[PDB]
Subunit: 472 residues, 3 copies
């Protein structure tokens, strides 16, 4: 590895942020754009952000000043002939990039690495007509580049393995964490994250719960840093929907990547979230706190509580059953007893559903029991698989499918989800913890209930459930 | 409070709408770009109102006063007097956006702006215009004077008072309105898809001649017209374009899948009645549906006994009401001759014999049916047959509409009763036919075909579980 | 009686079709608008037929006699004498519709008007054409003089008299006609899809190297060429395009899904033999697959006993022919080591070890097979494996085309034998392999993958129930 001079193409948020990372680590950076005004603004931004870090003592004055000196604005594409690495982050349109990379093939030596920050375009299609296709690769950073640790190092069909190793070593040296993946739709992060959003839209379309309740279960129950619906409001409905539709279409309309009419409606209505003041939520009025059910009195206490195995607690005559994807109602008529279905992980927020056939006294016994264990009990509709378990199962299923299709290694899939979108466990590590047979049973029940190919357990999930029963 | 009504576009539906508005007291400001097409359309209304005066439904005094309320215009700035605008122009996304942005400042701030669209989102149109809450869908059915239903379609911003206003207006026009949100196919065009689509599938697999399919749905199930003759009257191009529109708008959801058999009729210009040819030859006389000849009194059964689960045994044979399994599947399993029956209230009955039946065994089943005064049409051994399969799918679709918050249960039933003249509303019809019965049929079809198309929706499962507890 | 023949088009298929008609005693009006291309087409026919007079495959008297019958023309009005027109021009639907309209005025009402199109509907072409009942498809395969199959394609208007004429005519050209309706992929391009698609799926999951996949199908199943090397020879772009075309025309039916793997090669310009690299490196010679090495006689079986057919007990181990369940699934359900085998008639066999197997147990099974004289290829524990999975899907696809009335059983079988040179016609093959076996395998794959793609079609369930009698 001998990457010295780095060229960054584009003066937007990503280009400027990528330039900052490269220059802050000792590289001469050629920041290229055709507009000299644009370059000046982008460079003023970097100046301003780094100077405020020195103010707060988060960066030395020396490293600040040495960083700024390495940022060289250029308007002539020929100046990039000196670069060992070009990182492109300008127009997302395919034909523009193809034209850009064709131009860089003649300008630069054939040993210069030519990379793109794109999230949406095939590397293979970028690298298709250009001179030495083997040194074309994806180097995919996340907003904001100076803060986010993850980069996806993306191989196109032609991408050499030495090029991947060089790019991994270099981003390691920039204090990043590279993960490798092939040029398949959504890479790792945009692909595996999809059911986090789409399970919520489905819940929302069926009025299972208020959006605040869905977000509270996922954040304060499952441990995600932000609920999926609020996160779509903060990403911007237009942006998140465009990613969904893109992955959906690039997989020739796979129903596990189906878009939502609820989301579509918000986009075409211009209700894009925080940025426009209204989305799923109103961003003018400040955020309310989800309460949970008031304490049931000590007089409503159960006479006999018996924790059985397989997520069953028997409370007098009430079965409190952790969701396997069957409704409280189906269980209650099968077993001729009242049933409360619970959806819980480690967090304090817990969702529950009572079978319609429950007398309210039986439901209250179960609510009391839970409250006396520290949990905030939120009541929702009797929805198969509920919220937390339904969403995490589908996230894990998608991670497993990506692993099976050779998108990336198991460890790189876990890392990507931990760093790119801050999931509290990588999905594969999460599945091992939660139990493969348990995830399998749930998805099979969902698949049966809905009769949708969307809820199919993937072949590697069945494979891992079978291995797990082998150790049992 | 609406006085003057603007009706934009001079099409078939635009003319029928203007007639409804006029004959209920409203002064109608009819718009088009072509001034020659204006007088063309009004004289169409003149021609149609000269035959309803001859019957005695309207006197010639009120007839003339109706015709004098229709005022043709060609300038769009002059419509500032209209309290209500009803768009029925071209079905293009930019045709509507430009018109409504213009009508933001031409029309008053509180003037209700509606559209008769079958296929464009209301939210899409109301996006970049000034006052969003007064924009809606007012969806009439062909022909607008005769069909009693309008769908009042909310966009995302449409206010509930506006919804109420347009409901109050259509009520006053002899119509019965229904509320739905802006989702593909609204209520009527969505819930009715299986009526046609199942018939197309039957045809493709040559289950029966088209007349047999139409007779089964008409004089068996109780529909005013069979789905195939209906598509010939609607026009193949029109019905096929709605099927595709709904299919594409749900991102290719396979229970809305189009049919190659219909596509061939369209691309070959066989558009139905209007072109003289579609499914049927409309340039010739129609031979009525036969029904098998009666069998002799010597072929009479000895023993007849009704059993539980829609089975009646007749000698060594079994006449089984269809649960979605084939007669052949039932005959090899139960090791006895089986004939499967597809029937509701009407005289017309379809049947299938298991290929393993001796002809004598089948004739006994035909005889018993004939001795109940029923026309017996024999078709292929087809999972779910014709009537039960179709109605089960219509009901499934109705339940998914309800589940997804498109409209209320009573409104959905009203929509199918008045938008397409179904004998009962599907949700009421499901309760009468039995939810467990509907569920078990669709599961058997889901098993037989392995298609997501035939998936019981979640709400059906829920209601079947509730029914099992009564 | 057909005498004069008009061919329109001067490319590969245009030349070929002209060559066929000329050599069988027909005056051939070769049409193009260009005169430079017309000469270059005749030069190619002259080059090919003269390289066969020198190679002792044709006589000079017959060669010169054939090459005289080739009359190049640029005026479309010159085609008025033609008893039959065969079109093979540009595949845009507009240009074809415009040319065929022109032709009807120039030629008599009884002149047969045909096209060599693989992907455009005959009913669309015949829509606004005088006397449309004499319009059909005449679909030849590259290379036209070599390939024995012709698909004779009915539009909705195509007459039964015209079909007979074209069948009798093509028969007289030393060809074999098959009759089918105008539906996507006709017979051959539709039924052949899973041959390619299963291979791509195996590659995406890294089940085995591409050579191994190709050797299983060629030397184990008896296909003349394995699917992957065949796509390299067809051209990755051409094969992908047909896959996509069929997929889209069936409104995105999952049975016809394209592959990201093949897409990546097309997009990356690795189009196969024609550009030096596709799936395989054609710039270097390729070794045959070895197969596993001889296991020593120390792992000799204590006792060999054929258990219930499909299942063979070897002491510790069970050798189980694939029925769609993984070696691992069986291993833990039978509480015994399992080796799954995927075999038909050729020497080449694929096997998969269950992960729970001790390596000595697996070797016992390997030894046992090697001593039967078979090449053993070890691959991943893949549901349905390669041969049986592929053939079952080809059989399922042929059954679907049969029940949708695309073509008769014998014609489907004939079309696969002569169009793509398959060792057996799929429908005959399926009876020989047994319907219930094919049924059970597809059901096991459908359950495993939860995909509509692996659904048994309706006709397959019917034939499996029929097979359980006798
Ligand atoms: Cl996103
Ligand atoms: Cl319609
Ligand atoms: Cl091909």
């Amino acid at each position: 590895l001998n990457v010295q001079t780095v060229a960054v193409i584009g003066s937007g948020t990503m280009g400027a942020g990528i330039a900052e990372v490269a220059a802050s680590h000792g590289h001469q950076v050629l920041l290229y754009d055709i507009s000299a005004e644009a370059l000046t603004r982008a460079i003023d931004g970097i100046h301003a952000r780094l100077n405020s870090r020195v103010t707060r003592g988060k960066l030395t004055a020396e490293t600040c000043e040495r960083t700024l000196k390495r940022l060289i604005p250029v308007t002539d594409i020929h100046a990039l002939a000196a670069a060992d690495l070009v990182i492109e982050a300008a127009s997302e349109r395919l034909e523009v990039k193809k034209a850009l990379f064709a131009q860089l093939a003649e300008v630069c030596p054939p040993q210069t690495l030519l990379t793109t920050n794109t999230s949406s375009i095939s590397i293979t299609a970028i690298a298709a007509e250009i001179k030495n296709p083997e040194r074309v690769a994806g180097l995919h950073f996340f907003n904001p580049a100076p803060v986010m640790k993850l980069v996806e190092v993306v191989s196109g069909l032609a991408t050499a393995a030495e090029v991947v190793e060089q790019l991994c070593e270099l981003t390691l040296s920039w204090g990043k964490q590279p993960v490798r993946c092939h040029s398949t739709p959504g890479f790792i992060v945009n692909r595996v994250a999809r059911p986090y959003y789409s399970e919520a839209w489905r819940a929302l379309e069926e009025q299972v719960a208020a959006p605040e309740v869905i977000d509270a279960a996922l954040r304060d129950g499952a441990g995600f840093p932000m609920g999926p619906l609020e996160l779509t409001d903060l990403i911007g409905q237009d942006v998140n929907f465009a990613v969904t539709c893109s992955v959906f279409n690039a997989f020739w309309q796979e129903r596990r990547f189906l878009p939502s009419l609820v989301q579509q409606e918000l986009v075409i209505g211009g209700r894009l979230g925080k940025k426009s003041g209204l989305g799923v939520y109103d961003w003018r009025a400040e955020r309310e706190a989800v309460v949970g059910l008031e304490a049931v009195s000590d007089s409503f206490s159960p006479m006999k509580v018996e924790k059985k195995s397989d997520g069953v607690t028997e409370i007098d005559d009430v079965l409190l059953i952790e969701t396997q994807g069957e409704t409280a109602q189906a269980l209650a008529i099968r077993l001729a007893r009242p049933v409360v279905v619970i959806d819980k992980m480690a967090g304090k927020v817990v969702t529950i559903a009572a079978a319609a056939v429950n007398p309210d006294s039986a439901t209250r016994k179960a609510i009391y029991y839970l409250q006396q264990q520290g949990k905030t009990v939120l009541q929702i509709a009797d929805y198969p698989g509920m919220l937390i378990w339904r969403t995490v199962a589908m996230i894990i299923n998608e991670a497993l499918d990506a692993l099976q299709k050779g998108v990336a290694s198991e460890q790189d899939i876990d890392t990507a989800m931990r760093l790119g979108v801050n999931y509290p466990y990588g999905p594969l590590a999460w599945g091992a913890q939660l139990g493969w047979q348990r995830i399998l049973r749930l998805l099979e029940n969902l698949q049966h209930h809905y009769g949708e190919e969307r809820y199919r357990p993937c072949s590697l999930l069945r494979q891992r459930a079978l291995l797990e029963s082998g150790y049992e």
